[PDB]
Every structure is written in C-alpha cells, then in structure tokens.
C-alpha cells in the first residue's frame with residue numbers, strides 16, 4: 001500500500017510563511033516525480049508545483065512562481081513546500097501527489113497516480 | 125564504480141558512468157608500440173568525427189531528431205532501460221546500426237541548412 | 245555521390261556533400277608510413293583547432309560576424325554560388341586568406357569576452 | 365605580443381592572449397622524435413577531452429556552475445586579476461586543482477541529465 | 485513516440501586483436517616501462533564472458549617477443565667460426581664413474597689469435613653430445629654445428645634468468661581476467677574482472693614438466709583443446725608443487741682464450757675432483773600422490789572403470805624425449821622415465837639421470853645454434869613442478885610431450901582475453917531536439 005501523508009502547518013497570518021511536508025512510503029520514493037495540487041474548500045483542483053524525482057528540475061504555476069519553493073529529500077522519503085508572503089487567496093487544501101512527470105528513459109506520465117489526504121492551510 | 129564497473133548493470137544505471145569510460149580511452153622493437161598509439165588516436169578521432177557530423181560534439185548524451193522505427197527493436201522503454209545491459213542491447217541492434225548512423229547524418233545536414241536560411 | 249564527386253560542380257551544389265569529404269580525412273621500412281600517419285593527424289587537428297578558435301567547432305557550415313570587403317572578391321552571389329566551382333574560388337581568394345582568418349579570430353575573441361561580461 | 369609574451373603580465377591582461385598560446389600547441393634515429401610527436405598529440409587530446417567532459421568544448425573561456433570555496437584561495441578579485449600573474453596563481457592553488465576538476469565533472473553530469481529530462 | 489539518443493562512454497566491448505606492451509621492474513629490454521605498481525582490478529559484478537584458450541593471440545605475441553628478444557641478445561656476441569677445425573679428441577684422465585663413461589672428451593685444436601699470423605694450441609673438455617666423429621676409428625672429431633649454421637657464443641655477462649614480464653593493454657583496450665577456479669580454458673566464465681595489465685609471467689622455457697608456473701587454487705585441472713583427439717596435447721595444472729632438486733656435481737674450472745680482436749672464447753679447462761653424472765631428485769611420495777590426483781581427474785574424461793597407464797616418450801631427439809631446462813645457465817636434458825612408469829587400475833626419492841649440452845638450438849629452428857659458456861664451480865638449482873604436458877596414445881596410455889613452447893605460455897595466459905572498447909552507441913528514449 002502506497003501512502004502519502006501530509007504533516008503540514010495550520011493557521012497563519014497574511015504576508016508570513018508556512019511550510020508543508022509530506023512523508024511517503026510503499027513505493028520507491030526516488031522513482032517518481034511529485035507535485036502539489038491545491039483545492040480551496042469551495043473550488044476544484046489546481047496544479048501548483050512540480051518537482052523531478054532527482055530534485056533538479058522544478059516548475060510552478062505562475063501565480064506562485066516568485067513565492068513558493070518546492071523541494072525533495074530522497075533519503076528521508078520527504079516532499080516539501082515552503083510558501084512565502086501567504087496571500088489570502090492561498091487558503092486551501094494542499095495535496096501531496098505522485099506523478100505529473102517522468103525521466104525520458106521511463107514511460108511517460110502526465111497524470112497523477114497517488115494522492116495524500118491534504119493539509120489545510122489557512123491564511124487570515 | 126571504476127572502468128567498466130557498470131558493464132553488468134542495467135542500461136538505466138550504466139548511463140551514469142559515461143565519463144568513467146570516456147576518460148580511459150586516451151593514454152624493430154618499440155615500433156609496434158608507436159603504431160598502436162597512432163591507431164588508438166585515429167580510432168578516437170573517428171568517434172569524435174561522427175559526433176561532430178551528427179551534431180553531438182562536446183556532449184556524452186545527445187538527443188536527436190531521428191525517430192525509432194519499431195522494426196529495429198520493438199522493446200518498450202521498461203525492458204531496454206531497466207532489464208537489458210548495454211552488452212545485450214548492442215548485440216540486438218548490431219545489424220541495424222549503419223542505418224541509424226546514416227539517418228543521423230542526414231538529419232544533421234537538413235538542420236544545418238535550415239538554420240543558415242533562418243539567420244539570413 | 246562519392247568522394248570529390250562534386251569537385252566539378254558549382255559551389256552551391258558542392259556545399260551539400262561536405263560530409264562526404266570530411267569522412268575521408270581520417271583513415272627502416274614502415275617508418276616513413278608511420279610518419280605520414282602522424283603528420284596526417286597533426287594536419288587534421290590544426291584545422292579543427294582553427295575552427296574552434298573562430299567559434300565554428302562542431303559544425304560544417306559556420307556563419308560569422310565578419311563582413312566581406314568587396315576588395316577581396318567583388319563578385320555577386322549568382323556569380324559565386326552559380327557560376328564557380330570551389331576549385332576556381334579557392335584560386336581567387338588565395339592571397340586574401342590570411343587576412344580573413346585573422347579577422348575571424350578577432351571577432352571570436354571579442355564575442356567571448358562580451359558574452360562572459362553578460363553572464364555576470 | 366608573441367608566444368608567452370604575456371607571461372610576466374597580470375591575469376587580467378594575459379587572458380587576452382589565449383589564442384597566442386593555443387596556436388603554438390600544435391606544430392634507430394628519428395624514433396625519439398616520433399615518440400615526441402605522438403605524445404604531444406596525446407597530451408593535446410587529453411586536454412580537449414577534459415574540456416568536453418566539463419561542458420567547455422569549443423571555447424577558450426568557459427563559465428561554470430561550480431562555486432569558489434574560499435578555502436582554496438581567499439584572495440579577492442582586485443588581488444587576483446590586477447596583480448598576480450598566471451604563474452604565481454598556478455603555484456598558489458596547485459594542490460586544490462584535482463578537487464576542482466572533480467567538481468567540474470560532477471556538475472556537468474547533472475547538467476546533462478536535467479537537459480534530457482527537459483527535452484522530453 | 486521514441487527517438488534515437490546517442491551515448492558516448494558506453495561500457496561495451498568486442499573481441500579484438502591488438503599489440504600488447506611489456507611492464508617490468510638480461511631478460512629486460514630496459515624498454516619495458518616500470519610496472520606502475522599495484523594494478524587495479526574492477527570486479528564487473530554481473531558480466532559473464534566467453535573465453536577460448538588456444539585461440540588466444542596473446543600467446544602468439546608472447547612467443548614472438550621471446551624469440552625476438554632472445555635473438556637480439558646475441559647480436560653483439562662472438563661468432564665461433566675459428567673453431568671449425570678437426571679436433572683431436574682422447575679419453576679424460578680422471579676418476580670417471582660408470583654413468584659418465586664416454587660422456588666427456590679431451591680435445592686439442594689450433595685456434596686463431598689476436599694476430600693474423602699467430603696460432604695457439606688450445607685444449608678443452610667437451611661433452612660428447614656436442615661433437616661428431618669424422619674419422620671411423622681415428623680420434624678426429626668436429627663440432628656438431630660446422631656443417632649447418634655457425635654457432636654464436638652467448639655473451640658471459642648476459643644471464644638467462646626468467647624475470648617476470650607483465651603484459652599491458654594500449655589505450656582503448658582492456659584485458660579481461662577469468663577468476664573461475666575451476667575454469668578448464670574454454671566457454672563461459674561467470675566471474676570476470678578487468679585488469680589494466682596481467683600479472684607477471686616468468687618466461688621459463690622447458691619441455692615436458694612445467695616449472696615455476698601458477699598452481700591451481702583447489703584441484704588439478706586438465707585442459708585440452710579436444711580431450712578425445714590423440715593429436716592434441718593435454719595441459720595438466722597441479723594444485724600443489726612437486727619440488728625438484730637438480731645438480732651438476734662437478735667442480736668446473738673455466739678458462740678462456742682470445743680468438744680475435746676483442747673476441748674471447750670460454751671453455752671448460754679442467755675438472756677438480758671426480759666425474760659424476762648430473763641428476764635431479766623428485767620426492768617419491770609427493771610424486772606418487774600427484775599422479776594419483778591426475779589419474780582421478782583423467783577418469784572424468786575417459787571411462788571411469790578404466791585403466792590409466794603412464795609411460796616414457798616413444799621417440800624423437802633428445803630435445804623432445806627428455807626434460808629440457810636451464811639450471812643456473814647450463815642446459816640439462818633429464819630422463820623422466822623414472823617418473824612416468826606405472827599403471828593405475830580403477831624418505832625415498834626418484835633420481836633422474838641428466839645430460840649436459842653446450843651447443844643448443846633453443847627454438848625449433850634449423851639455421852641457428854648457440855654456445856653456452858661453461859659455468860665455474862658447481863651448480864645446484866631448486867624449482868617447483870607446477871604442471872605437466874601429456875599426450876595420449878581398453879587402457880589409456882599417457883606419455884610426456886611438450887615440444888611446442890607455446891604450451892608453456894598457454895598455461896599462464898589461459899585466463900586472459902583482450903577486448904576493444906566501443907564506447908559509442910544508440911538506444912530509444914522519449915527525448916527529442
């Protein structure tokens with residue numbers, strides 16, 4: 001069984017910062033690209049950020065491009081996201097997801113295979 | 125981790141040791157040794173010339189614009205790049221190598237002319 | 245279609261066989277043959293070094309930033325690429341060759357220092 | 365302005381004569397002279413191979429992604445490029461060289477994999 | 485869909501024939517590079533490779549290099565052409581045992597000197613094998629090689645010591661080593677590693693018993709191109725040495741003369757004390773245990789409920805029917821019928837009589853002959869028997885063989901193969917320009 005578990009933050013003030021992290025198990029962590037997908041309580045899903053399986057290549061939705069940092073630790077099976085300047089518009093559930101990219105010697109993806117439970121991030 | 129250490133490993137692993145092998149390609153009684161050195165150099169230069177012709181000069185990994193006709197090998201990316209060793213792969217596409225080299229040469233010539241007619 | 249087959253053709257045709265000729269540049273009794281092989285290698289390397297100095301490494305057709313002084317050859321394009329063979333062209337710019345090579349070297353050095361000063 | 369003419373000048377000046385030196389690297393009785401020619405060629409090729417490995421093929425000045433650990437030399441820019449000559453610089457950082465070369469190789473391997481994974 | 489991606493530095497190789505060079509620490513050239521010590525041996529964890537001794541070109545190069553270097557060492561040495569005269573030979577005036585009767589002769593002759601017009605009377609002691617009678621009952625004899633090519637005297641300053649030579653690959657090539665302890669010379673080898681250069685191999689030249697080679701790691705290994713073809717030789721590698729002690733127990737006084745302008749000739753002047761036959765000792769128990777092991781392994785190729793018989797070589801000249809070797813610079817020809825005389829069905833020692841020759845041909849050639857200067861004093865050498873060369877005729881009969889020197893070298897080079905590295909190749913990926 002594949003699990004992705006968010007162990008993130010809670011309620012913060014606008015303009016500050018909040019860090020999320022996700023622990024993973026049940027698969028080789030290092031074999032998959034990962035991403036964060038956001039869902040405001042009354043909205044659909046939005047892609048936020050993508051990181052390659054070796055941690056070298058990152059991509060962002062333009063709305064967070066100058067504010068968010070996505071990272072990876074393959075020794076600790078951990079995915080993380082550091083958000084800055086916390087806009088009120090960033091209140092949402094942040095899901096840890098596996099998929100969204102491959103490495104040119106692998107079959108392609110372009111879809112998400114696994115999801116975590118989602119951290120709820122609230123900005124006042 | 126040393127020269128040819130990855131020879132028994134899968135292609136998807138072996139491809140990360142390309143610099144290890146590249147650095148081990150260079151360096152009457154006594155005449156046969158000079159003859160061997162000269163030939164080793166000519167061999168080296170021919171490999172470099174092909175990379176030049178195909179537009180892969182200066183790099184160990186080079187992507188191209190030539191597609192993979194499945195008639196050469198219909199194996200999927202999983203089997204090639206996570207089971208087979210490079211030795212086994214080479215023995216499969218041994219017959220269909222000259223074809224590939226010819227296609228790579230033609231593609232680069234088309235690319236050079238188009239680029240020139242765009243900087244005009 | 246073979247080596248030097250285009251030698252009697254016009255420059256605009258001959259430029260399409262550059263790979264044909266490039267591939268034919270590489271491959272006490274026996275000493276003079278060994279000397280010949282060594283010298284052939286040195287000749288080859290000097291031409292490659294020179295292309296590198298001018299910023300043309302790795303390509304058969306290299307556009308540059310040096311302009312053509314009409315005093316070298318005042319012929320138009322339809323008199324150089326449609327009415328002349330490379331053999332006849334070579335014996336027309338023969339005594340302006342070193343001038344051109346010197347300019348190409350200077351142009352590349354200026355470009356390299358300017359690119360570095362832009363990466364800051 | 366000739367070969368090694370800039371040897372006594374400062375690094376910031378000497379760097380403008382890189383082609384002066386690059387062009388002077390290439391060109392039983394007689395065997396020793398053949399050995400010298402062959403070795404000069406192998407030496408040349410090893411340096412060219414190394415520039416290729418680091419991703420500096422084809423150029424005299426190459427900027428990289430490896431940062432300068434200050435433990436190798438904590439001198440500032442006005443002390444390195446305005447006063448020191450390349451001979452004195454070489455002596456100063458000679459034993460931290462094979463660390464720098466290793467870092468340059470590792471950086472390029474990572475750079476190649478990222479560009480292939482992006483051209484997908 | 486998929487695109488061709490070019491890779492350079494790919495760990496792939498193909499069988500190839502190239503020139504190898506020597507690395508060492510006179511059997512030098514002073515052109516062998518220093519060994520470059522402590523060679524590295526990358527293990528190649530999952531590489532299985534096909535080996536085929538007997539088709540291995542490394543053998544041919546070792547053979548040609550040894551012969552060439554041998555001949556080169558004689559280029560500056562004295563040519564013994566002034567000695568092709570009618571030697572007057574009589575019986576030696578000493579205490580000669582029965583085993584040595586007729587083995588030595590005291591020969592007088594007229595030699596040239598430093599001056600064209602001056603002659604000297606020289607006498608020396610020759611072994612019977614080096615001379616041939618021209619007169620029927622007369623005491624007139626001539627040197628063995630004055631009707632064929634001229635004999636070259638080996639230079640007294642040059643030893644014949646088998647100094648190890650390592651064989652190193654040129655750039656672009658690699659040597660693969662088979663580490664399978666039970667490898668029989670051919671076929672797949674499940675454990676293969678990459679050596680930069682081979683171990684040092686001592687160029688020991690001998691016939692039927694291989695001396696000072698490598699021992700098998702665990703058990704006796706019998707290797708042959710075709711074990712059922714009686715035209716092939718069988719190379720038997722032992723897992724234990726048999727120690728052999730050889731001697732020439734005669735105190736030799738060496739004298740010299742000038743024969744020309746800076747040209748000296750060396751010869752046996754006299755013998756101090758009694759005259760005895762040269763011989764070699766092989767421990768009896770050790771030798772019998774060694775054969776028992778060989779027989780047990782032969783039974784795996786031949787019928788199991790069989791009879792294995794050992795016998796002496798049936799014929800040919802001294803160079804092929806005896807155990808020929810260099811002991812302290814002298815050339816010995818020992819009779820091994822005392823070692824191979826038994827039948828095996830489903831503190832004693834063995835003494836082998838030895839003959840000595842000063843005029844030898846070394847290689848199986850017609851146009852060359854060398855004179856080995858006699859050596860002052862008494863010679864004793866001790867060496868290890870590390871393998872045997874046998875040929876095959878119910879009951880299987882085996883006899884000593886080994887006339888072809890390439891077999892000595894095969895016993896050391898069998899674990900090595902030379903391959904060419906081919907770093908360029910292609911494979912499909914999802915990457916495109």
Ligand SMILES: *[C@@H]1O[C@H](CO)[C@@H](O[C@@H]2O[C@H](CO)[C@@H](O[C@@H]3O[C@H](CO)[C@@H](O)[C@H](O[C@H]4O[C@H](CO)[C@@H](O)[C@H](O)[C@@H]4O)[C@@H]3O)[C@H](O)[C@H]2NC(C)=O)[C@H](O)[C@H]1NC(C)=O
Nearest residue numbers: 643645646688690695696809810811812813865866867868
């Ligand atoms: C198998 O291996 C063994 C072990 O290496 C080998 O035996 C060795 O042979 C050499 C050469 O005969 C012996 O070296 C001599 O030792 C005596 C000691 O008193 C020295 O006096 C000798 O020097 C004189 O002779 C030299 C010519 O050989 C001259 O060059 C020198 O100037 C002197 O005049 C010489 O050093 C060595 O002692 C033995 N080793 C042992 C343990 O006995 C054997 O020969 C090899 N077998 C085969 C077939 O190759």
Ligand SMILES: *[C@@H]1O[C@H](CO)[C@@H](O[C@@H]2O[C@H](CO)[C@@H](O)[C@H](O)[C@H]2NC(C)=O)[C@H](O)[C@H]1NC(C)=O
Nearest residue numbers: 575576577578590591592607608609753754755
């Ligand atoms: C070999 O023959 C020579 C003679 O050609 C012997 O030398 C002579 O020996 C006698 C004693 O019996 C001396 O008086 C002479 O002066 C010796 N002559 C010379 C020229 O030295 C020699 O002893 C014989 N050797 C053997 C082993 O038989």
Ligand SMILES: *[C@@H]1O[C@H](CO)[C@@H](O[C@@H]2O[C@H](CO)[C@@H](O)[C@H](O)[C@H]2NC(C)=O)[C@H](O)[C@H]1NC(C)=O
Nearest residue numbers: 569570571572591592593594595603604605606
């Ligand atoms: C060495 O030379 C001497 C002098 O020529 C030889 O002595 C003569 O030999 C011939 C036969 O060859 C005889 O007919 C003479 O009577 C001998 N004369 C003397 C002075 O004795 C001597 O025989 C030669 N030695 C050899 C090897 O034959």
Ligand SMILES: *[C@@H]1O[C@H](CO)[C@@H](O[C@@H]2O[C@H](CO)[C@@H](O)[C@H](O)[C@H]2NC(C)=O)[C@H](O)[C@H]1NC(C)=O
Nearest residue numbers: 728729730731732763764765766833834835864
């Ligand atoms: C090889 O074996 C022989 C025996 O066949 C040894 O010869 C004996 O040596 C001792 C030395 O103290 C003498 O007292 C004996 O009289 C000799 N025996 C005979 C029958 O003569 C010889 O020493 C051995 N060693 C070798 C070849 O190194």
Ligand SMILES: *[C@@H]1O[C@H](CO)[C@@H](O[C@@H]2O[C@H](CO)[C@@H](O)[C@H](O)[C@H]2NC(C)=O)[C@H](O)[C@H]1NC(C)=O
Nearest residue numbers: 796797802804805806807818819820821822837
């Ligand atoms: C080794 O010595 C043996 C003697 O022990 C020699 O064998 C004899 O050879 C003659 C001639 O062919 C035969 O008539 C005898 O019957 C053989 N004797 C035995 C006991 O078989 C043998 O020839 C010698 N071998 C070498 C290579 O010198």
Ligand SMILES: *[C@@H]1O[C@H](CO[C@@H]2O[C@@H](C)[C@@H](O)[C@@H](O)[C@@H]2O)[C@@H](O)[C@H](O)[C@H]1NC(C)=O
Nearest residue numbers: 191192193194195196197219220221223224
């Ligand atoms: C793909 O290959 C098809 C079969 O033709 C040939 O035989 C195979 C085994 C290869 O050797 C190939 O190179 C030969 O051309 C062609 O009919 C088909 O046109 C080819 N398609 C492409 C993409 O060129």
Ligand SMILES: *[C@@H]1O[C@H](CO[C@@H]2O[C@@H](C)[C@@H](O)[C@@H](O)[C@@H]2O)[C@@H](O)[C@H](O)[C@H]1NC(C)=O
Nearest residue numbers: 106107108194197198199200201202203204
């Ligand atoms: C890849 O294909 C595997 C089965 O391979 C089949 O036979 C080989 C020789 C090729 O012809 C290949 O195209 C065939 O499909 C599957 O077991 C494996 O799951 C596949 N992996 C994927 C989907 O990439």
Ligand SMILES: *[C@@H]1O[C@H](CO[C@@H]2O[C@@H](C)[C@@H](O)[C@@H](O)[C@@H]2O)[C@@H](O)[C@H](O)[C@H]1NC(C)=O
Nearest residue numbers: 310311312313314315316317339340341343
């Ligand atoms: C072109 O060059 C002229 C200088 O070159 C002169 O003529 C050439 C053919 C050579 O013979 C050379 O040695 C001579 O010095 C300059 O007058 C002229 O300004 C240049 N024109 C341009 C466009 O730069």
Ligand SMILES: *[C@@H]1O[C@H](CO[C@@H]2O[C@@H](C)[C@@H](O)[C@@H](O)[C@@H]2O)[C@@H](O)[C@H](O)[C@H]1NC(C)=O
Nearest residue numbers: 317318319320321322323324325326327328
């Ligand atoms: C190029 O010039 C062609 C020929 O013109 C004449 O001959 C040359 C050698 C000079 O002497 C020139 O002054 C003469 O007028 C023309 O026929 C051709 O059309 C021209 N082409 C173009 C496109 O300019």
Ligand SMILES: *[C@@H]1O[C@H](CO[C@@H]2O[C@@H](C)[C@@H](O)[C@@H](O)[C@@H]2O)[C@@H](O)[C@H](O)[C@H]1NC(C)=O
Nearest residue numbers: 430431432433434435436459460461463467
């Ligand atoms: C910078 O260097 C520090 C000390 O480096 C140590 O000494 C040098 C001469 C080398 O032998 C090096 O391998 C040793 O670690 C390091 O502790 C430090 O991590 C380095 N920092 C960076 C930027 O990597």
Ligand SMILES: *[C@@H]1O[C@H](CO[C@@H]2O[C@@H](C)[C@@H](O)[C@@H](O)[C@@H]2O)[C@@H](O)[C@H](O)[C@H]1NC(C)=O
Nearest residue numbers: 434437438439440441442443444445446447
């Ligand atoms: C550069 O440095 C000059 C003196 O250098 C001092 O010692 C060397 C070894 C370094 O540790 C350097 O950082 C030290 O400052 C100064 O005189 C000069 O003002 C400095 N210039 C600049 C541009 O900082």
Ligand SMILES: *[C@@H]1O[C@H](CO)[C@@H](O)[C@H](O)[C@H]1NC(C)=O
Nearest residue numbers: 129130132133134528529530
């Ligand atoms: C050899 O195969 C084993 C699996 O049997 C694998 O774990 C090991 O990594 C392989 N060795 C190399 C160098 O790839």
Ligand SMILES: *[C@@H]1O[C@H](CO)[C@@H](O)[C@H](O)[C@H]1NC(C)=O
Nearest residue numbers: 201202203204205206207208
């Ligand atoms: C290895 O081969 C098997 C069978 O074709 C295939 O299922 C697998 O995907 C291949 N490689 C891997 C481990 O991806």
Ligand SMILES: *[C@@H]1O[C@H](CO)[C@@H](O)[C@H](O)[C@H]1NC(C)=O
Nearest residue numbers: 196197215216217218219220
């Ligand atoms: C390649 O050609 C050889 C000789 O015709 C043939 O035996 C082999 O089966 C061919 N291999 C492939 C992959 O077609």
Ligand SMILES: *[C@@H]1O[C@H](CO)[C@@H](O)[C@H](O)[C@H]1NC(C)=O
Nearest residue numbers: 248249250251252253254257
């Ligand atoms: C030679 O000139 C004729 C025109 O007269 C042309 O058709 C032919 O292709 C030319 N041959 C070459 C090699 O250019």
Ligand SMILES: *[C@@H]1O[C@H](CO)[C@@H](O)[C@H](O)[C@H]1NC(C)=O
Nearest residue numbers: 321322323324325326327328
């Ligand atoms: C050269 O080519 C041009 C353009 O085709 C043409 O007008 C001119 O007459 C030609 N001159 C010759 C025949 O040399």
